[model samples]
Target: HHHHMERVSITERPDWREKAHEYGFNFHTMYGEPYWCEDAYYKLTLAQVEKLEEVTAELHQMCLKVVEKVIASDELMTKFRIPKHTWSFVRQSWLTHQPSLYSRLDLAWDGTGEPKLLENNADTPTSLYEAAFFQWIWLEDQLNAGNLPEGSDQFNSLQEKLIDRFVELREQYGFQLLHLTCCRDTVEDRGTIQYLQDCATEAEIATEFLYIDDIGLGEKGQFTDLQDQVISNLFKLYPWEFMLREMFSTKLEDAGVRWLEPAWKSIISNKALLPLLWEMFPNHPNLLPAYFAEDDHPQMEKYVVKPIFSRNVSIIENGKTIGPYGEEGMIVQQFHPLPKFGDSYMLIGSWLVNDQPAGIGIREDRALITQDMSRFYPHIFVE
Candidate 1:
């Protein structure tokens, strides 16, 4: 159940000094003072590391359950009907573009031994620039300098796994080319899109890039590109919340344009899934006890009410000014307290990679509810 890696001395590696210099890794600025060297590598006991793996596996299994429930629910069939012109597009998007189905979710384990499902960011998840790129490359240089560990590398290479998954989806769907699209204003979105674009290029698959606004409905009701080119399959970075609302709503369905993450993701993206989880597994072993806002619940005062269909951490409080979840429409959940680490409340993000538990990431916030101000930190497991 547990595995350990042999320890290696840092001083033996002199070549890493040169590589670190070449890579522009200023230890003082990157990790701070004396801790920047190999001694700075955080170590975890075999048992603790195994627990991280176990919880990751558990959450992945739970994600599958959530997906299955959604597929079977009347809500999905009702809101977005099956056997319609958009059915194929919807299915491809759900099974293809969503990162939750492939990207690794980060999980945090409290020293007290309880695992909390803080948040599930199934789409547009980030931190790969650090986790996959800088850290692993640094480790590789160290290993080449004769400072290698006894066991295999602990860092999971999600980049290759995600690319492979993309190929698998393309083959399964019998699609010739896939178009990756995002909003014109989303510059940060380019990082992920570019990464995937490289994957497609390497696979020898035809790839096209476009903006969300560039997609127009033709006279025949088919989704067309800016130049009036037909687009059958697409990997969109835009959130489903925006796609479901106004002018694009009916046109999106009418044109049969397949989204990468699927419009049905709106169901999960909204905090409404929290209440649904509670309904299905009211007192399950792993889930935090949750309920929707009602007239009689005593915990309502302490609970935070959230919008049933909004992105970001928008919440409402009794004495606070009206926020995103005001009198209009809201879905509330019990505010389960997270274990504190120093001055911050911990939030563990676990990812599901290719329908399996892959890895863990961590974020912390000073407030009871995590907002834009939360500090995200890279998590590494040592064995």
Candidate 2:
């Protein structure tokens, strides 16, 4: 399965760095220098790349199955009202909005035939601006200056693919402009929001940035902006849980502000979706059996318990100690160890881009639980 190694250098254009800095990227100061930026430019040997593709296919199938099961669940319908009309729209938005959706597909590969899906951040996924913009620019500069290793940059074109998808979706959706918002607490969330805004700007579409708290609700249940303007279409970086509780949710129907991530994301973003997927496909090959925390399943000990609605990597135990609630506040999932790739702990993010297996992204952690502090690395495959 080995293939030829091709090297491509991605460099940061002068203005691009300034632009990224204005958008709040301080990578040089924060982590000193991003090692992954240089590493991603180093090309993989043919065999290494083939394995990534193989894993991606398997992970894609798994994501499709998970999404299908979620779509068919009565719980989704009861809780989220995912009507058929908007179901595909939400699915497509995830596919088109993020580059990781497609890049993730290409980077996934397990040593075995199947790629393992650690988790999919279907809604409000971040790190895109870093992965697609910052990293890609870094590669471009390196390539142009011949600073990277030979035979690298084989799959660096993923950035263009991602940008194209964003443009295509904006045109397809007939949106003249897109509004991007995030919670005030989530400064990191702004990364992707600004990234999407950049993409929209590149496509010549208007974009507005705001915080969730910036939106005001009128007495008649209509959403108004700070300037008393109405927003018709919104792309929020806020999570589904918080959004559902906000006053905007009550006014959304009448306000007609179509949310880009969509409200139905509650179905996929919840860790409970893992248990639901297992219940829907008990005999499925890719899925490790998952069960609710309250379930009396005999395989409980082999699983790690997690909160149903916590953000990425929250509530994980680094030691053997258990929390006060034991497993009551959590849903238990079968523990599937992440494959060690070089010096990194690897987790594959398989994306559902436009109802298809778009791509894959790789996250490398120094520890088992992928916490807020874990470093994310962009992966490229060559074949």
Candidate 3:
């Protein structure tokens, strides 16, 4: 699993800001993430890319198996903290083979040990537009300007895969328009949804837009657009638990609207997925030891207590817990320290579009746990 570095190097790119803006990737630097580093890019060997791709595919299939298992067992449904009220809807979504667009598997990998599965963002995974579009642009510009090797390529097939997935979806599920909705005032979520909408459009599938709040339940209990047009199909960049807890939960079964990620995704998106995957696969090469937060076991030492509703994990160390936790269910995963790439530690956010290894998105930070402020960096392979 080793390959020659092949002069894997890094150097700053000039005029990055203007180039990023021209590409409409103005969010290259996030408001809170002060670490919008683009001065240099990360390099990998062709062999490295192949390894990551293979592992991503394997992990995705494994996650799917876990989802199917969770669906069949009431024990698992509770373990995943899936609300009982939506069990029928969630199970039916899975049974019907509802279309799932994409997901990002967060992995903790060093150059040595097998990459450990930190968690799965099977629903509403962000950084898509950046990983898919802008980063590829960076790869091209870098190579064109002699900043990178002539044969350098990026670990990115996201846009290609997105459009491809959309094409299949249009034929498999008959729908006229796929409404794409996100929270108001959220530039990142809006950008991600827009990028996906563009892909669906490229597939010749018509799409519309709305803020999640703008979606209305008609008198007949159908979800609707701004014009009160029945939403036959839709994609929302919002969490399922939030949607399920609202008045919309009762109408979900009757809406007759298709969801991109689907209702079943609610089970996997929870942090509980880590332990669920572990319980099912126990010490699988690609997994870390994980358990329900309250499970007192030997693995309790040096563990991370992660909450479902958190944007990040709760760092539980030495008889005390840190970060956020509690009200939301918790999962304790054995702490796997992130590998340092420089002054910061790096974590890989690998992408899967339509169950295939589309590509990857990299995030790193100075802290042990990467959060909203973690900076994303483009990666390339010397092929």
Candidate 4:
């Protein structure tokens, strides 16, 4: 009975920066710009949150079906453009039920109709620290300071969901030590894995940290940490696409280490999944019409083209392409643009812990495409 757009302004917490540092959210300000927008926040009704939760859960199930369809056929694997050598690895991961930690599905909605799916960040989605932790903190601080009304809350249970999921994974898999690693230089990535490690610690799982580069292949073809211990279960922040072709790619099949996201995610994370979703669902409410570039349907008036592996996209306006085109194959999806607030376009990132809907985060950009530099704003749910 309650749902509408409401944007509120309040005094920024003077100590938020200090708190960011204290919590190890190092990328709060990135490249000399504020990445976490704190002066204002968006408000949602409980009804809206409930609706999104249902949608998120259903869509995730639909994605799993697509994974099942892809892994059954070698032709579908070739169509998804996954590397040939890694196809069996991906298939085996799905067949054996290798567990996935979490993923974020980007959506476009303005509190009306259905939230259109832009893409799935099924591999290595970022902005974890601010969305799951810092945003909740902002809500609490505002409520306590009397800046927000009583009963103020957010649509986030990411931290708790992650901790519980970690416990479940450990109990199910019976892995003693969980190794978490990411690339060295990206502060955002480091902070993400560190936060995940914290969740693992809360779940009473033994954990270790390392840089992706420090990983070595032992003489017996096992992946090893710098301390020379064999890695049994790993949660890597790196994407499987790159790992499937990297220097040690050949060793992966025999490495004997289980991955957090699992190798099967390579198919779900690819842009080709968009067209496949369309072909399978054929007018699902949340999915926009999509087609592989090679498919010849009626000429689309306007569409967005994206590479199968990259996030960089091109908007086609009246037969003219408006952005960089990658050498890799491409797919075209019906354009359902993000809703504009002030001078910015807003995109919602809905999160899933395994198959459950955990919560959401919001990102806005002045440009049409929300890129790595887009600013994140906290959200609240109120009646």
Best by TM-score: 4
User: What is every candidate's alpha-carbon RMSD to the true fold?
Assistant: 7.1, 6.4, 3.1, 2.6
Cα lDDT tens digits for candidate 3, 1-383: 23132223467677877765665555644533223466666776677778888888998888888889999999889877777888898999999998889998887765465778877788877677778887887788777888776777788888888888888888867755789887787654425666777788999999898988898978988888999889988888777968877865877887788897899888778777787778778779999888776665454557777775534665666655435456347777787787766577777789999789888777777888655436877878775
lDDT of 1 by residue, 1-383 (tens): 12131223345344645654554433332110111234333334556556666776766556556656666655643332233443444445556544332443434346444565544555445443334444566566655665555543544555566666667766765446778887786532324566567676765667888887787777888878767889987877666555655464656656665556555454455555566566677665456644444323334434566555534344444534334445344555555566565565555555555565545444456776543224444434545
- TM-score per candidate, chains pooled: 0.71, 0.72, 0.90, 0.94
lDDT tens digits by residue: candidate 4, 120-161: 889887777888888988998888899987888899999999
For residue 104, model 2's alpha carbon misses the true position, in angstroms, by 7.1
Clashing pairs in 4: none
Query: Number of the top candidate by lDDT?
Result: 4
Model 2 lDDT per residue over 218-285, tens place: 66656667676777677776666555555435444455566766654555666666676677667565
Error of 4 at 209 (Å): 0.4
Report how far off residue 178 is in candidate 1 (Å): 1.5
lDDT of 4: 0.82
Q: What's model 2's overall lDDT? A: 0.54
Ranking by lDDT, best first?
Answer: 4, 3, 2, 1
Q: What is the C-alpha lDDT of each candidate?
A: 0.53, 0.54, 0.76, 0.82
lDDT for residue 104 in candidate 3, whole number 0-100: 86
User: Which residues of candidate 1, in runs, are more than 4 Å off?
Assistant: 1-50, 67-108, 141-155, 188-190, 295-302, 311-328, 372-374
* RMSD (Cα, Å) of model 3: 3.1
